[PDB]
Design a protein around this ligand. Structure first.
Ligand SMILES: Nc1ncnc2c1ncn2[C@@H]1O[C@H](COP(=O)(O)OP(=O)(O)O)[C@@H](O)[C@H]1O
Ligand SMILES: [Mg+2]
Length: 300
């Protein structure tokens, strides 16, 4: 498979420093993190002060190209509550430097569209949420328990978009709709998955050569138990382990999430998983857990 895992350590936060937490994360080359003297090796390791643009360039840039070249793809942020998942995928949406993966992907995609000649494009976006193994449409709050059919989500809103501005507006709209019938936003968002889909259609007007690529950009529920592992996250660990083994059968049916992502995760699809970590001594075992999860994808 074409699954890459990259590990991102964020800085110690204010509140970790108030306790006398130490920085337990040690670094060996550009692909290795060391914790309690155990090495953990990934496709890349991002140290605490890594810029938002370096994470983009290594995690995501090539997958855009592959989408524009007609492949499907997935990028995930996985990790503990407060580990940096949302900072990685979204970050400061409108800030040229604080911008996370999604808004950069949208900038690159359009830099390619606008730079073309006989090529015609249709780009459409969907944005939904998975909570308790159920799908809610984040663009239409009247659609709360959507079903997955043979791979598409029945009834999901799809919006045609002509500029990155309309994409970002669609995300901000989504982020706001997500508060509907939710009492506690952080709590809920750390307990659910948010999934953004860019579908990029191209037709060469003079050659009738058509291409389509889907890109799912997923900010996953928090990885630490709440007393089981979140259901989509166990499905996903099992899909990854099976791809890692080169199993001919992949248990996509283990969750609605891995059923939607079936044509975009494994096989011919491209996949980066950004595992996010806190460097704090306080979180040593959850971090170990996050690394362990990251390693399921190492081929055997
Ligand atoms: N690489 C980083 N650099 C600076 N601050 C960060 C970084 N990652 C996370 N933070 C901050 O720590 C807090 C938790 O990040 P967030 O992405 O909200 O965590 P999560 O989505 O994993 O629960 C946020 O306020 C975020 O701004
Ligand atoms: Mg978050």
């Amino acid at each position: 498979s074409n699954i890459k895992v990259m590990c991102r350590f964020r800085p110690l936060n204010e509140s970790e420093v108030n306790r006398g937490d130490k920085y337990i994360a040690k670094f060996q080359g550009e692909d290795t993190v060391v914790i309690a003297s155990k090495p953990y090796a990934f496709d890349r390791v991002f140290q605490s002060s890594t810029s938002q643009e370096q994470v983009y360039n290594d995690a995501a840039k090539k997958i855009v190209k592959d989408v524009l070249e007609g492949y499907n793809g997935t990028i995930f942020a996985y990790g503990q509550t407060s580990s940096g998942k949302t900072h990685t995928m979204e970050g400061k949406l409108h800030d040229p430097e604080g911008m996370g993966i999604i808004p950069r992907i949208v900038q690159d995609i359009f830099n390619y569209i606008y730079s073309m000649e006989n090529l015609e494009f249709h780009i459409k976006v969907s944005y939904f949420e998975i909570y308790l193994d159920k799908i809610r449409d984040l663009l239409d709050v009247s659609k709360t328990n959507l079903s997955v059919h043979e791979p598409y989500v029945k009834g999901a809103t799809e919006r045609f978009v002509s500029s990155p501005d309309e994409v970002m507006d669609t995300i901000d709209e989504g982020k706001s709709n997500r508060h509907v019938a939710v009492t506690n936003m952080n709590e809920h968002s750390s307990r659910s998955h948010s999934i953004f889909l860019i579908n990029v259609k191209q037709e060469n007007t003079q050659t009738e050569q058509k291409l389509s690529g889907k890109l799912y950009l997923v900010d996953l529920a928090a990885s630490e138990k709440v007393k089981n592992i979140n259901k989509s996250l166990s499905a996903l660990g099992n899909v990854i382990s099976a791809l890692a083994e080169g199993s001919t059968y992949v248990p996509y049916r283990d969750s609605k999430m891995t059923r939607i992502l079936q044509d975009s995760l494994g096989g011919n699809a491209r996949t980066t998983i950004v595992i996010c970590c806190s460097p704090s001594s306080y979180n040593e075992s959850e971090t170990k857990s996050t690394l362990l999860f990251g390693q399921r994808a190492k081929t055997i």
